[PDB]
Amino acid sequence: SQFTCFYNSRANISCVWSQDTSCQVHAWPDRRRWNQTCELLPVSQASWACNLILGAPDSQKLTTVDIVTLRVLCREGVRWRVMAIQDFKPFENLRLMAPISLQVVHVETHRCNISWEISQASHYFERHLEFEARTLSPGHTWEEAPLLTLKQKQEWICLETLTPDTQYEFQVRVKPLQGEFTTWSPWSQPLAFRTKPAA
Amino acid sequence: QLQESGGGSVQAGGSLRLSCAASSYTISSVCMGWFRQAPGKEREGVAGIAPDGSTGYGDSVKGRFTISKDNAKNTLYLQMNSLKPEDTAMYYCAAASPGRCFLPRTALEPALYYNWGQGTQVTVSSG
Ligand SMILES: *[C@@H]1O[C@H](CO)[C@@H](O[C@@H]2O[C@H](CO)[C@@H](O[C@@H]3O[C@H](CO)[C@@H](O)[C@H](O)[C@@H]3O)[C@H](O)[C@H]2NC(C)=O)[C@H](O)[C@H]1NC(C)=O
Ligand SMILES: *[C@@H]1O[C@H](CO[C@@H]2O[C@@H](C)[C@@H](O)[C@@H](O)[C@@H]2O)[C@@H](O[C@@H]2O[C@H](CO)[C@@H](O)[C@H](O)[C@H]2NC(C)=O)[C@H](O)[C@H]1NC(C)=O
Ligand SMILES: *[C@@H]1O[C@H](CO[C@@H]2O[C@@H](C)[C@@H](O)[C@@H](O)[C@@H]2O)[C@@H](O[C@@H]2O[C@H](CO)[C@@H](O)[C@H](O)[C@H]2NC(C)=O)[C@H](O)[C@H]1NC(C)=O
């Protein structure tokens, strides 16, 4: 039915396949000297997924001249049948890793400066990003979180929306400003902190 | 959407020409291909054309068939020459999703396509 893959900007293509039982993704980069497969494993009742690890985690294995033909192959007895296929331009399908290494730089009674790191991405992409940040507060849900979206070259944010002496959690996600099918990264692991008491 | 045409009856050694009317966008932007399905056989690839105009053909029809597009007329063609009885089958055109195909060898894969034509019959009499 649907065959969707994303590239983390370095050396990791992750594919998801859902159809209405032994299947693989075959990766065939045009005019390169290697091919690679991964075994599609159940991820939901509906879909399968696996990752094509192209090299070391911070290695720039692909560029904008690369074209990776991606095939879903499944076992039809002793023959392998092509179930889905796409020519994959990697930088048209970016989805970065979730930001990591969150830490409270400085917390006060109504504000908090939180910084993070962008992993497995060239310094180029750090300068062409959009960020989204949200907070969790007592009595509310992540869906009710106030959302902040920011187009900036900056891996920190000073939240102004806080109340004193309160427990919070903070999450951030990233999206490059390029690529037709580029999507948001997953949310970072939530960072817990508490605002200071009112003086 | 996709509408085949030009499918009829010819004798062996003849030469026919299929037409597939499509949108202005698909004719200019997306991979397209011709496929055939003989009775008791699966749909096999005949010819494929990539957005850059590059082409590819199945082994059985190489040199005889020619795939082409006309952006002015919003039409895909399959010029088939020197037809043989083996070429008797239902012929289908198909258009790929935009941005999902750039090479004619991929455009030859039936698994690529979710938009197909109704098909046109092509019968060749044994000579
Ligand atoms: C919120 O916290 C972040 C993280 O600490 C602050 O960003 C940091 O700002 C300092 C101040 O300029 C930067 O330090 C500078 O480093 C350069 C390195 O060459 C040095 O030349 C300067 O003399 C200075 O020491 C630091 O690099 C920067 N860090 C990051 C990750 O951006 C931010 O300023 C804080 N925001 C507020 C409103 O306080
Ligand atoms: C990468 O793979 C392609 C394709 O290989 C075939 O298709 C895969 C999906 C899988 O089914 C494989 O087991 C198949 O072998 C290779 O392309 C072939 O290259 C040879 C040259 O050695 C050529 O004669 C064949 O016609 C090609 N096949 C097709 C379908 O075009 C390619 O060589 C592989 N690259 C590397 C570096 O191994
Ligand atoms: C390689 O990537 C997979 C998939 O991660 C997702 O897709 C990437 C392209 C990128 O967009 C990520 O931000 C996405 O999260 C990673 O596998 C996942 O790892 C997490 C953490 O262990 C796990 O919760 C998920 O279930 C995993 N998903 C699958 C399908 O395995 C993998 O860790 C990455 N490897 C490297 C070396 O970067």
Side-chain angles (χ1 to χ4, degrees), chain A residues 1-19 21-44 46-199, chain B residues 1-10 12-40 42-127:
Chain A
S1 201
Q2 196 56 269
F3 177 33
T4 311
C5 305
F6 290 103
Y7 174 49
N8 79 335
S9 90
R10 288 297 213 192
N12 184 350
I13 299 177
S14 187
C15 288
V16 184
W17 182 53
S18 43
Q19 188 68 61
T21 59
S22 181
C23 300
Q24 281 192 130
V25 173
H26 184 268
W28 177 4
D30 191 28
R31 283 314 206 160
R32 305 290 290 276
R33 300 175 292 166
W34 95 93
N35 288 341
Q36 195 183 342
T37 79
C38 60
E39 191 70 33
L40 280 160
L41 294 176
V43 295
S44 285
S47 48
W48 296 254
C50 59
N51 313 316
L52 307 150
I53 303 305
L54 309 178
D58 210 30
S59 83
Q60 193 63 58
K61 284 303 300 215
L62 304 167
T63 65
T64 49
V65 285
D66 275 301
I67 303 181
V68 186
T69 300
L70 296 167
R71 295 171 155 80
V72 172
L73 311 174
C74 295
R75 277 221 193 244
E76 219 187 21
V78 298
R79 198 86 303 281
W80 287 86
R81 198 169 100 145
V82 175
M83 305 293 300
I85 184 172
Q86 59 179 295
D87 298 337
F88 182 81
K89 291 212 167 194
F91 296 82
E92 299 304 301
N93 301 266
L94 296 170
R95 186 180 60 189
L96 304 180
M97 316 295 303
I100 58 173
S101 303
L102 274 63
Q103 59 170 300
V104 170
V105 183
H106 183 68
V107 64
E108 304 172 3
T109 59
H110 294 84
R111 73 171 78 244
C112 191
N113 183 7
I114 291 164
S115 67
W116 59 85
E117 288 183 356
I118 300 304
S119 76
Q120 298 178 250
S122 71
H123 292 128
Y124 168 73
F125 278 108
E126 298 181 359
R127 312 189 288 274
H128 297 269
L129 295 177
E130 169 189 32
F131 301 90
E132 210 165 61
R134 65 179 182 189
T135 48
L136 183 65
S137 79
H140 303 270
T141 68
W142 284 112
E143 284 77 13
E144 299 171 344
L147 272 168
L148 173 46
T149 312
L150 186 48
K151 267 148 46 206
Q152 205 103 310
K153 164 54 178 73
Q154 127 247 56
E155 298 182 11
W156 58 270
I157 191 145
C158 192
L159 306 164
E160 300 284 342
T161 46
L162 315 180
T163 49
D165 199 30
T166 304
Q167 296 288 150
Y168 288 97
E169 287 182 357
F170 172 91
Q171 288 182 306
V172 65
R173 59 174 186 175
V174 298
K175 210 224 288 182
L177 297 172
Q178 75 134 100
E180 177 172 17
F181 311 101
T182 297
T183 63
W184 287 103
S185 71
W187 291 99
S188 72
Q189 297 299 115
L191 170 64
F193 69 93
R194 187 189 183 90
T195 48
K196 301 220 168 310
Chain B
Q1 240 171 344
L2 264 52
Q3 250 305 316
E4 290 108 359
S5 155
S9 28
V10 295
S15 306
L16 191 54
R17 184 194 178 95
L18 294 185
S19 174
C20 176
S23 340
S24 189
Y25 182 81
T26 83
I27 298 296
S28 43
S29 321
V30 308
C31 276
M32 298 185 57
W34 289 100
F35 298 81
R36 68 186 179 186
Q37 188 158 33
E42 57 258 74
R43 221 173 272 195
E44 72 169 335
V46 173
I49 190 165
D52 67 359
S54 158
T55 68
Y57 303 93
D59 278 350
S60 177
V61 307
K62 193 92 198 64
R64 312 185 278 120
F65 296 11
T66 286
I67 190 170
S68 71
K69 278 178 314 199
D70 199 301
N71 279 336
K73 255 157 175 167
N74 294 342
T75 299
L76 174 87
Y77 307 88
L78 182 66
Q79 178 73 30
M80 333 191 227
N81 304 331
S82 170
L83 292 168
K84 283 155 160 253
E86 305 97 68
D87 303 340
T88 285
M90 288 280 310
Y91 281 66
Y92 304 85
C93 60
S97 306
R100 296 309 181 185
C101 170
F102 303 92
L103 305 165
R105 54 160 153 98
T106 294
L108 271 161
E109 242 295 345
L112 177 70
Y113 297 96
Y114 307 100
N115 307 273
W116 295 80
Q118 289 297 127
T120 198
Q121 235 298 339
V122 171
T123 80
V124 160
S125 97
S126 314

PDB file of all heavy atoms in Angstrom, chain B residues 19-32:
ATOM      1  N   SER B  19      -1.672   5.211 -28.059  1.00  0.00           N
ATOM      2  CA  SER B  19      -1.749   6.551 -27.502  1.00  0.00           C
ATOM      3  C   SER B  19      -2.366   6.478 -26.114  1.00  0.00           C
ATOM      4  O   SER B  19      -3.337   5.747 -25.894  1.00  0.00           O
ATOM      5  CB  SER B  19      -2.571   7.479 -28.407  1.00  0.00           C
ATOM      6  OG  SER B  19      -2.762   8.745 -27.802  1.00  0.00           O
ATOM      7  N   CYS B  20      -1.794   7.232 -25.178  1.00  0.00           N
ATOM      8  CA  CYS B  20      -2.263   7.282 -23.797  1.00  0.00           C
ATOM      9  C   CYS B  20      -2.426   8.750 -23.421  1.00  0.00           C
ATOM     10  O   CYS B  20      -1.433   9.452 -23.201  1.00  0.00           O
ATOM     11  CB  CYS B  20      -1.285   6.563 -22.859  1.00  0.00           C
ATOM     12  SG  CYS B  20      -1.643   6.614 -21.070  1.00  0.00           S
ATOM     13  N   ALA B  21      -3.671   9.217 -23.370  1.00  0.00           N
ATOM     14  CA  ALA B  21      -3.951  10.604 -23.026  1.00  0.00           C
ATOM     15  C   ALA B  21      -3.897  10.788 -21.516  1.00  0.00           C
ATOM     16  O   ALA B  21      -4.494  10.011 -20.763  1.00  0.00           O
ATOM     17  CB  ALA B  21      -5.319  11.025 -23.561  1.00  0.00           C
ATOM     18  N   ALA B  22      -3.182  11.819 -21.074  1.00  0.00           N
ATOM     19  CA  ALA B  22      -2.991  12.073 -19.655  1.00  0.00           C
ATOM     20  C   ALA B  22      -2.969  13.577 -19.417  1.00  0.00           C
ATOM     21  O   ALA B  22      -3.139  14.379 -20.341  1.00  0.00           O
ATOM     22  CB  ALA B  22      -1.707  11.408 -19.144  1.00  0.00           C
ATOM     23  N   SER B  23      -2.755  13.955 -18.159  1.00  0.00           N
ATOM     24  CA  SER B  23      -2.741  15.355 -17.767  1.00  0.00           C
ATOM     25  C   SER B  23      -1.541  16.073 -18.379  1.00  0.00           C
ATOM     26  O   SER B  23      -0.616  15.459 -18.917  1.00  0.00           O
ATOM     27  CB  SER B  23      -2.697  15.485 -16.245  1.00  0.00           C
ATOM     28  OG  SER B  23      -3.133  14.292 -15.617  1.00  0.00           O
ATOM     29  N   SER B  24      -1.562  17.404 -18.285  1.00  0.00           N
ATOM     30  CA  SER B  24      -0.387  18.171 -18.678  1.00  0.00           C
ATOM     31  C   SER B  24       0.771  17.938 -17.716  1.00  0.00           C
ATOM     32  O   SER B  24       1.934  17.934 -18.137  1.00  0.00           O
ATOM     33  CB  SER B  24      -0.730  19.658 -18.751  1.00  0.00           C
ATOM     34  OG  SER B  24       0.332  20.394 -19.328  1.00  0.00           O
ATOM     35  N   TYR B  25       0.474  17.711 -16.433  1.00  0.00           N
ATOM     36  CA  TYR B  25       1.534  17.544 -15.446  1.00  0.00           C
ATOM     37  C   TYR B  25       2.216  16.189 -15.586  1.00  0.00           C
ATOM     38  O   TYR B  25       3.448  16.106 -15.596  1.00  0.00           O
ATOM     39  CB  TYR B  25       0.976  17.719 -14.032  1.00  0.00           C
ATOM     40  CG  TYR B  25       2.030  17.600 -12.949  1.00  0.00           C
ATOM     41  CD1 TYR B  25       2.855  18.676 -12.633  1.00  0.00           C
ATOM     42  CD2 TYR B  25       2.205  16.410 -12.245  1.00  0.00           C
ATOM     43  CE1 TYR B  25       3.822  18.571 -11.649  1.00  0.00           C
ATOM     44  CE2 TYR B  25       3.170  16.297 -11.258  1.00  0.00           C
ATOM     45  CZ  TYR B  25       3.974  17.379 -10.964  1.00  0.00           C
ATOM     46  OH  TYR B  25       4.934  17.267  -9.983  1.00  0.00           O
ATOM     47  N   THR B  26       1.432  15.111 -15.681  1.00  0.00           N
ATOM     48  CA  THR B  26       2.028  13.778 -15.696  1.00  0.00           C
ATOM     49  C   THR B  26       2.917  13.581 -16.920  1.00  0.00           C
ATOM     50  O   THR B  26       3.999  12.989 -16.821  1.00  0.00           O
ATOM     51  CB  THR B  26       0.940  12.703 -15.645  1.00  0.00           C
ATOM     52  OG1 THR B  26       0.433  12.466 -16.963  1.00  0.00           O
ATOM     53  CG2 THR B  26      -0.202  13.141 -14.739  1.00  0.00           C
ATOM     54  N   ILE B  27       2.486  14.083 -18.081  1.00  0.00           N
ATOM     55  CA  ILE B  27       3.274  13.920 -19.301  1.00  0.00           C
ATOM     56  C   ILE B  27       4.615  14.635 -19.184  1.00  0.00           C
ATOM     57  O   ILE B  27       5.606  14.227 -19.805  1.00  0.00           O
ATOM     58  CB  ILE B  27       2.468  14.412 -20.523  1.00  0.00           C
ATOM     59  CG1 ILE B  27       1.200  13.575 -20.699  1.00  0.00           C
ATOM     60  CG2 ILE B  27       3.302  14.348 -21.796  1.00  0.00           C
ATOM     61  CD1 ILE B  27       1.468  12.122 -21.019  1.00  0.00           C
ATOM     62  N   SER B  28       4.684  15.693 -18.379  1.00  0.00           N
ATOM     63  CA  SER B  28       5.912  16.458 -18.251  1.00  0.00           C
ATOM     64  C   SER B  28       6.751  16.082 -17.035  1.00  0.00           C
ATOM     65  O   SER B  28       7.965  16.316 -17.052  1.00  0.00           O
ATOM     66  CB  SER B  28       5.591  17.956 -18.193  1.00  0.00           C
ATOM     67  OG  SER B  28       4.481  18.209 -17.348  1.00  0.00           O
ATOM     68  N   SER B  29       6.156  15.488 -15.994  1.00  0.00           N
ATOM     69  CA  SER B  29       6.785  15.455 -14.678  1.00  0.00           C
ATOM     70  C   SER B  29       7.086  14.070 -14.126  1.00  0.00           C
ATOM     71  O   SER B  29       8.008  13.951 -13.317  1.00  0.00           O
ATOM     72  CB  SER B  29       5.907  16.186 -13.648  1.00  0.00           C
ATOM     73  OG  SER B  29       5.322  17.349 -14.204  1.00  0.00           O
ATOM     74  N   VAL B  30       6.336  13.032 -14.503  1.00  0.00           N
ATOM     75  CA  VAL B  30       6.389  11.762 -13.780  1.00  0.00           C
ATOM     76  C   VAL B  30       6.815  10.631 -14.706  1.00  0.00           C
ATOM     77  O   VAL B  30       6.618  10.689 -15.924  1.00  0.00           O
ATOM     78  CB  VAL B  30       5.029  11.424 -13.123  1.00  0.00           C
ATOM     79  CG1 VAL B  30       4.528  12.594 -12.284  1.00  0.00           C
ATOM     80  CG2 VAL B  30       4.006  11.038 -14.174  1.00  0.00           C
ATOM     81  N   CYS B  31       7.400   9.588 -14.113  1.00  0.00           N
ATOM     82  CA  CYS B  31       7.682   8.364 -14.854  1.00  0.00           C
ATOM     83  C   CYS B  31       6.400   7.787 -15.436  1.00  0.00           C
ATOM     84  O   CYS B  31       5.337   7.831 -14.812  1.00  0.00           O
ATOM     85  CB  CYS B  31       8.337   7.318 -13.949  1.00  0.00           C
ATOM     86  SG  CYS B  31      10.119   7.469 -13.740  1.00  0.00           S
ATOM     87  N   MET B  32       6.506   7.238 -16.642  1.00  0.00           N
ATOM     88  CA  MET B  32       5.394   6.551 -17.274  1.00  0.00           C
ATOM     89  C   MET B  32       5.914   5.291 -17.949  1.00  0.00           C
ATOM     90  O   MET B  32       7.113   5.141 -18.190  1.00  0.00           O
ATOM     91  CB  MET B  32       4.669   7.449 -18.282  1.00  0.00           C
ATOM     92  CG  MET B  32       4.060   8.689 -17.654  1.00  0.00           C
ATOM     93  SD  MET B  32       3.109   9.653 -18.832  1.00  0.00           S
ATOM     94  CE  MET B  32       1.950   8.413 -19.388  1.00  0.00           C
TER      95      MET B  32
END
